[PDB]
């Protein structure tokens, strides 16, 4: 199947301050493996996954210095967006970035991604060709002209076909065991004045419950997830429905009733 790496970066300007808050989070196959946060007393890039402790000191020193450089880059770009949009530095503003790559079934680069959002809305994004930009509005068109003139797309396309694929290959080799894990859900059913099917303790988050109301899948905090789906039965007719749960951790899909 496919695989992916992503980095989610966030900068928030702080009025009357020079340094915005900068947070950077790494993801392999949508699982967080690294994080940096400018809020710490001595901020340092840190492993969020067991298999990342296999990397040595030069790794964490280098990623740390990179992150401080990115904090500066977002500080600049924030100042520029104030001008494009004629805003005041008296307000807090938010800039976000998603970058990384998807490897196909053949482990070759399938798709590269680089995109930015301002105030939580799409601003500019590098296209599938890793050559051209899509700008979201008139302000982003300024940036797009700038980046055309500077050839920034080349820098990114190099990274995406570069380091992104390499380091992803290596993060897959390192994280192999852990990343293949599946915890099967444990399920049960409750009656109310309304019957409810609970799936608890499962990983990864993709799951199907079928009898109806349902809640978005939620973290338990312990590395597993929870979901439930319910109906309103005809109050006298019990075994009103059967609850099936399909999840890739189950030897077979479960079946339950009240």
């Amino acid at each position: 199947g496919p695989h992916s790496m992503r980095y989610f970066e966030t900068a928030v300007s702080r009025p009357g301050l020079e340094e915005p808050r900068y947070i950077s989070v790494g993801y392999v196959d949508n699982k967080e493996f690294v994080r940096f946060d400018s809020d710490a007393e001595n901020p340092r890039y840190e492993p969020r996954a067991p298999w990342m402790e296999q990397e040595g000191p030069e790794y964490w020193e280098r990623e740390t210095q990179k992150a401080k450089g990115q904090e500066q880059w977002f500080r600049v770009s924030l100042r520029n967006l104030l001008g494009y949009y004629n805003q005041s530095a008296g307000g807090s503003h938010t800039l976000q970035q998603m970058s990384g790559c998807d490897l196909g079934s053949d482990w070759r680069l399938l798709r590269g991604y680089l995109q930015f959002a301002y105030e939580g809305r799409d601003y500019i994004a590098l296209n599938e060709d890793l050559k051209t930009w899509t700008a979201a509005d008139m302000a982003a068109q300024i940036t797009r002209r700038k980046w055309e003139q500077s050839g920034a797309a080349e820098h990114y396309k190099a990274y995406l076909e570069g380091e992104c694929v390499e380091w992803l290959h290596r993060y897959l080799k390192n994280g192999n065991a852990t990343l293949l894990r599946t915890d099967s859900p444990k399920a049960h059913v409750t009656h109310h004045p309304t019957l409810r099917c609970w799936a608890l303790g499962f990983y990864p988050a993709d799951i199907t419950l079928t009898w109806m109301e349902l809640v978005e899948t939620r973290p338990a905090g312990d590395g597993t997830f929870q979901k439930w789906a319910s109906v309103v039965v005809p109050l006298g007719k019990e075994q009103n429905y059967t609850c099936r749960v399909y999840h890739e951790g189950l030897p077979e899909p479960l079946t339950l009733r009240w």
Partner: peptide
């Protein structure tokens, strides 16, 4: 491995 951004916005 974190990408390093190019030209500023």
């Amino acid at each position: 491995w974190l990408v390093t951004n190019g030209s500023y916005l």
